[PDB]
């Protein structure tokens, strides 16, 4: 039988779309040694390369469809008994420049997932691999050299009997791929920063453990005779002073067994250690259930009198530093039935009602951890 | 004229490069990668290069996608040379590629004794909804180079200052290695 082949629907340029099963395109394994530590890279490859050797319903569609308007969804499956816990982070970055930092500070910033297998059964996240457009393709991520990593932010509280394999499941979803673009307006409704404020290690004991982390977030993170930087922070460092509502994400990175009540408050470097009046300041009490591992902190503009500097000269002492610090204080005592330190992760999610003042000429020195 | 226009917004130094020391005297040059923050001396000439770490460079070296106008100020120093004996010339070129097949996007010639100051600007614009990803294989995108030629290395000692225009936008993160302090 003859047929007008030209008129056939062989020019289907629609994106990948359907059920979860027919939108899966790849799966990977991440080997977690039972003996690992913070800053220990677990997986480090190209996003595109994920499809190599894969045989799923949308593997072909993903690789051949030259335009996709949806998002990439990553499902992580991994779970460990409440006796332990750890912090895994998965992050998507647009590219690299050789021998790059693998520190959680640099690795995060753009798009990421942070979770604790001792609390979550699984974890999922969607993203826009083309951060400044409404569409993307497999060919684009191949040639633009999109990267993805999995890293152990916090080691095991209690070592597993054997090595653990975490599994990633990559699929396409119908969520609209909206862009995330930064610009220089001096007034912005929402500014994503995803800044790794720090890893707070609180050892078990009855001592008064206090941790400080500056709200003068620009300048990067002090490594050695060099420093780490990512795009969001370099962008905020464009302004000399700034203010707004702060949104932090606090992650319990230790096992459920390690407990401690943590107080969050904003004050200045004039407060010393061993000061049992910290609770005078407006503050938030953070506790986590064995199920829970994530708490959002909000610091409205009523917590600040004025704006504050994006950078200070690193030689500045706490006493001499008039910029505000976020305090993390062991409200009671760090303990548990097992050994291990209460690791708590703090990340600045972003700023609401952002005000940017002036323009920063720049300081080469960072700020130190 | 005797009265010059007043500059306004803040420019930041970003890259400097000294011509090779005496007895070097052959005509030489140095290339500045205005986006990735690289300095490449021509041939094996002993150029004393150095890169700073201001917000602008920190952005340029980490922003995956860029779009907008960049203002550049080029300062040329500036050696103890008797004005009457000055014969140093500065030739600069904007380029979108160091390949011989590519043509100059802009040429300036400076024959000022002592020192000089050149202001110019250029636009970053690419195929990704207006964004450019500096030398990515995708769509054959390339960076911007500033080639500086010095006809007399003993008279001419270069400084690149940069500023983002308010229309400058960025997106995406590049995993950079640690940045060494000046």
Numbering used by the authors:
A (entry chain B): 1 to 369
B (entry chain A): 1 to 157, 159 to 183
Please quote the authors directly.
Until now there has been no individual structural analysis of CPMV-T and the RNA packaged into CPMV-M has not been visualised. The resolution of the map permits the side chains of the large amino acids to be visualised. EM density for S subunit residues 184 to 189 inclusive were not visible; these residues were removed from the model.
Cowpea mosaic virus (CPMV) is a plant-infecting member of the order Picornavirales, with a relatively simple, non-enveloped capsid that has been extensively studied. CPMV has an icosahedral capsid structure, which is ~30 nm in diameter and is formed from 60 copies each of a Large (L) and Small (S) coat protein. Crystallographic structures are available for three Comoviruses: CPMV, BPMV and red clover mottle virus. Together, the L and S subunits comprise three β-barrel domains (two from L, one from S) each of which contains a ‘jelly roll’ topology.
